[PDB]
Amino acid sequence: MMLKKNDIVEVEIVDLTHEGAGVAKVDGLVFFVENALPSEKILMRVLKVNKKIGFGKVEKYLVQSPHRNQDLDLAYLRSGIADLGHLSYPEQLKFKTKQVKDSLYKIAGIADVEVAETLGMEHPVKYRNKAQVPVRRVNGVLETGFFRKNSHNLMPLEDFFIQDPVIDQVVVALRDLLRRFDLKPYDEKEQSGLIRNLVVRRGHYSGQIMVVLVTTRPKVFRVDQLIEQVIKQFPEIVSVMQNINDQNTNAIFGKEWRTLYGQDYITDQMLGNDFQIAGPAFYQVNTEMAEKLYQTAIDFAELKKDDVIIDAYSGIGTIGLSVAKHVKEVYGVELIPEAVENSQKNASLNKITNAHYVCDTAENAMKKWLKEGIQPTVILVDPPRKGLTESFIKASAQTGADRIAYISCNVATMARDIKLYQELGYELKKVQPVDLFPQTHHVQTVALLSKLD
Template identity: 25%
Template sequence: MGIGRTDVSSHSSNSSETKPWVIMVPGVIPGEKVVVKIFRNFPNYSEADLVEILQASPERTVPPCPIADACGGCQWQHMSISLQREWKTRLVQEALEQYGVTYSEIQPCLGTDETLHYRSKLTPHYQQPAKSKRGVQNEKHIEAIGFQKQTSRQIIDVTECLIATPAVNAAYQAARDQLLSEPSTKKKGATLLFRQANLDDDYVESDHRVFLTTVVDGLKFTYRAGNFFQNNYYVLPIMVQELVAQAIKGDQMTHLADCYCGSGLFALSAAKHFDRVVGIEVNDLAIEEATTNAVANSISNVEFLSASAEGIFKVIQDFPRETSVVVVDPPRKGCSEEFLEQLYTFSPQRIVYMSCDPTTQARDAAGILKAGYSTTYIQPFDLFPQTRHIECLMVFEKKV
């Protein structure tokens, strides 16, 4: 048991003259004085539970969810929205400074007033029912359906998720009631799916193979319910508009390459501003969806290819470098070295990089700057309020 002051988001640090020691504590706010109990030690840090708050931050709030302290789905419900966004901006800043990325300013984290009931997709889980002493599966009711706890892989029972839309919650609760009332037919646990295509339609799909159509900024995007598509329809149009605005800034760009294009969201949204657009995605099903979406929206100047991101540079050899934009939206692990080396060799005038992980984005940004670019714009987005997750847009311009 110990007392410390928190220095960083979700951490508290105890220092001595010889060696600083980091203690990871969920549910705290920088500047608070707290009592914690350490339950696990690692070579460079410890994990602890919050026991008591001796001096609370003025930004501390009562979590709207009664199980927020235990559920791993939301990590920041104890913080005001203004402080959440302040810290998301700061975490982007810290990541950039860690990798020595130079920039002029970071825009304040951008979000909307919809900080609850915004999520259009929910994927709760349940675990395998307990076995009898003889190792035979019991005809037993499922004990919990929900999400992993903050400190373990154990499932915590969730009756309602306050960040999911009302329609998604209604569908989840109906399915949950049915599953809990019957003996489990699954030998193993399962992950459920509940996805709403549009906020003005309460229909929710639970079959990952079924096609849904979502309208974003006037364009229709069709995709399989189980495939990737952003699930905050309040912030998504703002994010798309901002990316497109940065891609076309200056009215001199003529060609766009969209790497990791998915079902074509960014490529098709920007297409009307460019002479030619090429999108590439390793997922064959996503490319089928992107091609279908181009036809459905009567967009004819876009070509979609199924290949790894590195493959795009063979296709765009004839793109004029001085008026070309490359959009990069990689998975959480960031871009591969092979991709970045080919990007540097291609040397487009502008790189527009959207990321869901500020740390890997900052790592890649450091390499981009060394390749002869400067950072011209940084915009974090609060796509997932009440959680620690951040989307961040960075723009790089080729130095003269």
């Protein structure tokens, strides 16, 4: 047969993609059906027929999965912020464990290495310490909410499910004040309006709140009066920042940062020590599981008093300063000035005078450290989704480091980079996934690579 647009066909889902979309096969075409779990009988409406693949919609459910979550509140967030909410939490952990095993095989050619089960939350809800929230006009009303997948169409929402309840109350309180003061929301198509987004970071243990008003222009009309109101409702707001982003882009922040009130940072704890976090600086969104993520990497590293650690992709120096008292030297690198400046202050704040940072790209610092004659025994790395470059992997091999711990939020690039480490004499010993992002497709992973000879 020859399928085409708006044809209803009975199919069976036999797999999930890494992003969470159901996979079905009909006449040599791999169809990707949204909101469809494995072993489900459905009438699939064909959306777009392609050369080798296809795309579909569930027109009717004939048989649903035993592992389906019927929660109506999570179903609203499926095409968006909680794209594995419709799968039950035990199976999310099995799914993410499978993704690490499948990716290490398909990319790296590895089938005989320990990938233990994913360490999940006891209560997998209300976890995010940061929350980026766009502001838009919906039916002539200023609304805070979330975009649907593959769009900038704002779905208004108050209860975010996966975010801190206090952050939800702050963004709802900010929404009301933007309505009250009559500040115009940013229209993306028209290129009109002031208030683009709202970023609200809140410490997991401390509870100290930052607010960032992302805007098109520098001038915000009656902002000091608007700031004065949120302090009465939420005294824990130690800082209110302003970011200016005049360009038309999917990216949130522009260049110019300003301090409208109080500090230019919040303070929050991880493990024993305290850490100052700036607005543009990175902070692990799930502090509870990030502590378990670090403690896995720290135990995997098998640290000694005479070890020399490299914490590449430092951020605010959470991993490095957590182990600096238990080792001889700690060397870190971080591209963003605001993050590495926190990192230096965090070392001083916790009486750590052996944490030596540099502001550069990771590959550049490794070339310098290799040239100037540093002798690192352990290499801890925690890059973004894109992962490591070939320069860094080759340079880090030439240092003659005993162990390398790879923390990642994208197994695809991790499996690619591990494949190159195997070519330069580093065997992959252990792997341990940790669920930093419940109710979503994203998988955090730690991986001990140990050297031969």
